[PDB]
Amino acid sequence: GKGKPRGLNSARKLRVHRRNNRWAETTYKKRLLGTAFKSSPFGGSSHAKGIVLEKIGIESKQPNSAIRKCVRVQLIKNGKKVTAFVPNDGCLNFVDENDEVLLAGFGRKGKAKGDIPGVRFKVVKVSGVSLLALWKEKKEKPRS
Amino acid sequence: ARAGKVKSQTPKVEKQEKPKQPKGRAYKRLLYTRRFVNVTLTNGKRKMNPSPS
Amino acid sequence: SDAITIRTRKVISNPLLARKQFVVDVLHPNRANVSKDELREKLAEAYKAEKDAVSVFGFRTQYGGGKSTGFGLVYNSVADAKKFEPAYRLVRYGLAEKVEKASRQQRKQRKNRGKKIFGTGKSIAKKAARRNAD
Amino acid sequence: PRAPRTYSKTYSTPKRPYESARLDAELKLAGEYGLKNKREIYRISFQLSKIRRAARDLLTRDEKDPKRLFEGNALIRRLVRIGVLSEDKKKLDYVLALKVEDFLERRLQTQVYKLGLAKSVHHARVLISQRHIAVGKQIVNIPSFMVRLESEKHIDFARTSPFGGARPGRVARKRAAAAGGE
RNA sequence: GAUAGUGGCCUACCAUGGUUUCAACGGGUAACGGGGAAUAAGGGUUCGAUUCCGGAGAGGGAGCCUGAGAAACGGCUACCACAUCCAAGGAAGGCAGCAGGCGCGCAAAUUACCCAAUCCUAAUUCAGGGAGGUAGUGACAAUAAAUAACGAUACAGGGCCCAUUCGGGUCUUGUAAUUGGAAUGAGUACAAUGUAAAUACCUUAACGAGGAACAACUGGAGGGCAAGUCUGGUGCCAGCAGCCG
Numbered sequence: 039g040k041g042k043p044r045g046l047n048s049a050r051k052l053r054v055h056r057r058n059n060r061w062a063e064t065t066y067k068k069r070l071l072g073t074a075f076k077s078s079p080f081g082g083s084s085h086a087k088g089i090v091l092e093k094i095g096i097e098s099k100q101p102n103s104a105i106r107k108c109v110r111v112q113l114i115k116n117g118k119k120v121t122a123f124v125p126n127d128g129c130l131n132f133v134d135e136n137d138e139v140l141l142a143g144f145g146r147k148g149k150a151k152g153d154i155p156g157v158r159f160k161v162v163k164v165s166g167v168s169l170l171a172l173w174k175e176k177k178e179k180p181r182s
Numbered sequence: 183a184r185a186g187k188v189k190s191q192t193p194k195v196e197k198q199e200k201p202k203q204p205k206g207r208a209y210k211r212l213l214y215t216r217r218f219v220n221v222t223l224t225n226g227k228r229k230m231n232p233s234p235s
Numbered sequence: 236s237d238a239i240t241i242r243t244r245k246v247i248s249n250p251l252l253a254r255k256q257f258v259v260d261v262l263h264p265n266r267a268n269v270s271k272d273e274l275r276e277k278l279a280e281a282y283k284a285e286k287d288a289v290s291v292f293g294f295r296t297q298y299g300g301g302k303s304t305g306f307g308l309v310y311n312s313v314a315d316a317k318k319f320e321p322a323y324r325l326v327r328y329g330l331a332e333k334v335e336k337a338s339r340q341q342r343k344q345r346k347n348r349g350k351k352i353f354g355t356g357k358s359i360a361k362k363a364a365r366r367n368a369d
Numbered sequence: 370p371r372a373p374r375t376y377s378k379t380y381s382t383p384k385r386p387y388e389s390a391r392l393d394a395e396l397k398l399a400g401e402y403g404l405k406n407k408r409e410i411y412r413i414s415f416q417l418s419k420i421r422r423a424a425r426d427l428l429t430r431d432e433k434d435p436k437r438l439f440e441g442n443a444l445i446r447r448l449v450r451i452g453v454l455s456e457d458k459k460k461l462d463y464v465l466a467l468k469v470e471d472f473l474e475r476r477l478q479t480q481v482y483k484l485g486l487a488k489s490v491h492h493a494r495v496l497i498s499q500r501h502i503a504v505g506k507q508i509v510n511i512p513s514f515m516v517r518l519e520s521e522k523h524i525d526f527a528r529t530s531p532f533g534g535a536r537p538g539r540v541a542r543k544r545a546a547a548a549g550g551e
Numbered sequence: 552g553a554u555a556g557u558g559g560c561c562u563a564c565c566a567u568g569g570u571u572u573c574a575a576c577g578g579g580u581a582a583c584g585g586g587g588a589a590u591a592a593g594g595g596u597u598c599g600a601u602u603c604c605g606g607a608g609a610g611g612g613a614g615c616c617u618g619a620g621a622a623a624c625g626g627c628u629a630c631c632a633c634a635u636c637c638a639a640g641g642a643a644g645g646c647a648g649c650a651g652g653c654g655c656g657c658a659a660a661u662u663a664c665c666c667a668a669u670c671c672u673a674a675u676u677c678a679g680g681g682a683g684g685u686a687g688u689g690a691c692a693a694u695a696a697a698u699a700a701c702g703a704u705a706c707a708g709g710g711c712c713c714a715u716u717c718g719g720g721u722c723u724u725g726u727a728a729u730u731g732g733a734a735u736g737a738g739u740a741c742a743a744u745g746u747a748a749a750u751a752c753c754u755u756a757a758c759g760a761g762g763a764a765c766a767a768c769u770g771g772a773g774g775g776c777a778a779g780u781c782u783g784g785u786g787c788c789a790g791c792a793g794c795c796g
């Protein structure tokens with residue numbers, strides 16, 4: 039029995055069949071179609087710099103309720119517009135309109151985090167300095 | 183402002199000037215003493231950080 | 236005690252360069268670093284050959300003192316030493332004297348400048364003069 | 370375009386971070402042998418593992434087969450030299466049963482402690498770091514030095530430093546100076 | 552015919568073949584190939600611009616000269632693209648060499664010293680070499696490891712000579728801004744090494760430890776997952792939360 043061929047000269051069939059099947063595995067598909075380059079706002083890169091258009095509070099999904107404090111960013115490298123969450127309690131009032139910002143992914147590999155709908159990106163650095171540093175009061179924002 | 187209110191509210195309590203911890207191998211030694219040398223006050227299920235209340 | 240127990244280990248006699256080459260192993264006790272000159276002198280005394288016919292280089296202390304290991308050559312004559320030993324070493328010793336070049340960059344620049352003229356530029360100078368005038 | 374230099378990562382982290390029992394064991398080990406880090410322990414473990422890999426491989430080959438006879442034998446010899454295996458157990462089968470303690474009980478740390486010269490492991494460690502303690506008239510700075518059994522007879526204080534008889538130095542000297550013109 | 556020579560390599564005449572479901576042909580490659588690298592029961596999976604070996608290319612395409620060797624670009628000729636200097640007649644260009652700049656970006660160093668070593672070139676032991684080495688910058692990675700060590704006294708835990716109630720505590724431990732002499736490189740620094748000359752190392756005279764220093768951070772403490780239902784604040788807000796929350 040068993041669906042596969044077994045014979046000592048099958049080989050080719052085993053190969054081709056495996057290849058065919060591989061396309062149902064999502065990661066593999068992504069790798070091969072190259073959807074990290076063609077689609078996706080970051081050009082298959084770990085980080086991206088963009089310019090802040092405006093500051094937008096986003097209402098969280100259910101069980102929860104709280105205005106999340108995100109930022110609408112337009113990335114420098116391609117010109118694509120994305121929403122980016124600004125972490126920590128203050129921090130939204132470190133950003134301002136027309137400011138250069140360094141965005142990382144959220145930590146779900148393209149997918150949205152937690153309860154914040156349509157947001158796939160963090161804010162790491164504003165005007166060249168780390169948000170965390172600012173928050174902890176280790177450095178100051180050197181204007182814009 | 184909506185943002186950053188809780189932090190603003192909180193009383194700015196300062197850190198107490200303490201005797202410094204002995205960092206490195208010394209720290210490890212200290213830890214060992216705390217745990218497996220002294221074996222001080224054992225309930226059966228041996229606790230690490232008990233609440234003072 | 237100062238001691239300074241000097242040893243010549245791994246002695247190759249080399250007629251092709253008119254020298255004797257060896258690993259110098261020197262003992263310190265309580266004294267840090269032997270100094271090259273002193274070592275050379277010691278070698279000379281040992282080997283009967285002149286102090287300028289001796290060359291010692293490439294020393295390292297044992298770690299935690301006590302010993303120094305290096306490399307030593309003793310040439311047959313001073314003339315021999317002069318005509319086989321590297322120039323820098325000779326200079327260090329005190330026999331030959333420093334060659335006075337400009338910084339290599341300057342030299343390169345000069346060379347480049349020279350390249351830009353065909354022949355000795357006396358005619359060129361004249362041309363510059365007369366032409367400049369009128 | 371010069372020939373590349375070889376590096377090797379000499380330790381391996383655990384495959385599961387907060388295995389509590391394991392952690393406690395590690396801590397205990399550290400306490401026993403005055404270890405600055407879990408890193409040291411990990412290093413030792415890695416070393417052990419390498420040995421085990423070799424031994425297992427050797428075992429997998431037929432006995433009295435050349436490679437096994439050679440390489441395995443060499444390994445055994447090395448182990449005996451280091452002093453981790455005992456003379457009873459020159460076997461290759463016993464090499465698999467070694468366990469981390471035997472390597473730690475062979476450091477220039479522990480050895481120093483166990484020959485006098487110390488009063489506890491920490492003291493010994495301090496001495497080692499402080500450039501007291503020489504082996505073959507060679508001052509050893511390294512706490513995890515692995516004493517080679519035949520050299521274990523020679524562990525003593527340095528001819529430099531106090532303790533092994535030279536100039537007192539620094540604090541004692543200062544005290545002497547103070548005493549002097551008073 | 553041409554070539555160094557074989558060959559539809561090209562030309563004339565002739566024949567109708569050649570490849571292909573054991574994927575030809577076409578398309579894509581965010582493809583230089585390999586040695587290898589990461590992972591690591593066994594089998595695999597992914598990566599390999601990059602130190603060695605091949606191969607291409609010197610902005611793009613052509614075309615050639617010299618020569619044993621180049622279809623060479625730190626040779627030339629042209630065109631296209633981009634560009635300098637100009638007295639407007641003309642003239643010069645090619646950093647995917649090294650250094651450096653602009654731009655692009657998430658993303659990468661000094662317009663440093665030298666041929667002493669490694670080798671190479673020449674008519675040549677000598678000259679030349681941004682090949683190469685040497686320092687500068689450098690938490691890319693990797694190795695080794697300082698941030699204390701041993702004492703006393705002063706309050707508690709543990710063995711107990713015996714438990715008429717104690718208790719001496721004879722023996723061992725931890726904890727106190729108690730206190731005590733020892734040890735040291737981190738630094739500095741004479742020297743001497745080192746070195747082409749220097750740095751730094753290794754070696755060392757001299758200085759160099761008592762808490763305020765010569766101060767370890769980075770993340771966590773519901774679970775997964777080691778660690779608090781401690782004390783304030785906040786009150787479905789601010790926020791946290793990879794997931795459940």
Ligand SMILES: [Mg+2]
Pocket residue numbers: 500529530
């Ligand atoms: Mg010393």
Ligand SMILES: [Mg+2]
Pocket residue numbers: 582
């Ligand atoms: Mg390509």
Ligand SMILES: [Mg+2]
Pocket residue numbers: 582
């Ligand atoms: Mg490839």
Ligand SMILES: [Mg+2]
Pocket residue numbers: 599
């Ligand atoms: Mg390659």
Ligand SMILES: [Mg+2]
Pocket residue numbers: 600
């Ligand atoms: Mg590429």
Ligand SMILES: [Mg+2]
Pocket residue numbers: 610
């Ligand atoms: Mg270019």
Ligand SMILES: [Mg+2]
Pocket residue numbers: 624
């Ligand atoms: Mg060309």
Ligand SMILES: [Mg+2]
Pocket residue numbers: 625646
């Ligand atoms: Mg060029």
Ligand SMILES: [Mg+2]
Pocket residue numbers: none
């Ligand atoms: Mg060229």
Ligand SMILES: [Mg+2]
Pocket residue numbers: 646
């Ligand atoms: Mg360059």
Ligand SMILES: [Mg+2]
Pocket residue numbers: 659
């Ligand atoms: Mg970088």
Ligand SMILES: [Mg+2]
Pocket residue numbers: none
């Ligand atoms: Mg180079």
Ligand SMILES: [Mg+2]
Pocket residue numbers: none
């Ligand atoms: Mg530096």
Ligand SMILES: [Mg+2]
Pocket residue numbers: none
């Ligand atoms: Mg903290």
Ligand SMILES: [Mg+2]
Pocket residue numbers: none
């Ligand atoms: Mg937190």
Ligand SMILES: [Mg+2]
Pocket residue numbers: none
């Ligand atoms: Mg907390």
